[PDB]
Structures are given as structure tokens and as C-alpha cells.
Amino acid sequence: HTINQTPHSHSISDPGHAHGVPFGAAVDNGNNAFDTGGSPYNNGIGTTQNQTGI
Amino acid sequence: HTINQTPHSHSISDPGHAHGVPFGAAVDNGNNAFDTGGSPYNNGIGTTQNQTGI
């Protein structure tokens, strides 16, 4: 018998996620890491918009 | 009738996603947040690696 198939897609369940920034400065010389200030306040800074390899 | 079936896989349609980092310090005392600055340049700092849970 001949099959009559139409393409199908699956719905995705997406619990959120987040990454860590483990680069806090212990010394003052160098640009290797980020200076640790000590006051929680949201300045305007995000990340690069990069996809996920799945 | 008997079905002759092989496993199939779908392609994803990943659009870029960007997080945010709200830990900008207002006082340079303590290590709770990050001190702010004026001119942004890429100093080679990236987030950590972690699987998105989907």
C-alpha cells in the first residue's frame, strides 16, 4: 500500500537556564578578569546572542 | 500489513538567545558585584558551559 504522510513537528518544553561568570578580580593588574565591586544593581549589560548546539 | 520503519530525526530552528548579567556595582567595597566602566571592549571573558534543560 501507498503511504500518505504529512510532515510533523514536536512541541518543545523549555525550562529556563542561566550561566555563571566565575571571573572576579583578585588583583588589579591585567584585563584577564572583572573587578569585584560589591553592590547589586542592574546596569545595562548582557551577553552575546549565541545559539545552542543541540 | 507489516510496517518497515526506520528511526527519524527532526531539525531544530535555534534562534540566538542572550542572557543578562545584572551584577554591576555602585560601590567599590566588597566582592558582591562588578565595578562599572566607560568604554566597552572585548577582553575575552565568556560565561561558563552548561546544558540548557529542554
Side-chain angles (χ1 to χ4, degrees):
Chain A
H1 283 272
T2 286
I3 303 181
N4 200 40
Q5 177 174 170
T6 323
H8 81 274
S9 70
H10 299 279
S11 195
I12 174 60
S13 66
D14 195 336
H17 79 294
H19 315 258
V21 198
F23 301 126
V27 307
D28 178 46
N29 55 84
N31 53 13
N32 181 282
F34 278 148
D35 215 29
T36 43
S39 167
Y41 135 80
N42 171 91
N43 186 340
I45 274 161
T47 67
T48 56
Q49 184 177 5
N50 56 329
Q51 318 181 354
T52 93
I54 72 170
Chain B
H1 266 302
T2 294
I3 302 185
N4 243 322
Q5 186 195 31
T6 66
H8 74 297
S9 63
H10 309 248
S11 61
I12 85 169
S13 171
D14 198 317
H17 83 273
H19 301 240
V21 49
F23 303 145
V27 54
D28 209 359
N29 307 0
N31 64 83
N32 153 268
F34 287 142
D35 181 18
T36 190
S39 289
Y41 76 98
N42 181 21
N43 51 334
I45 288 185
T47 74
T48 195
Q49 297 276 359
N50 31 7
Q51 316 193 287
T52 170
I54 66 181

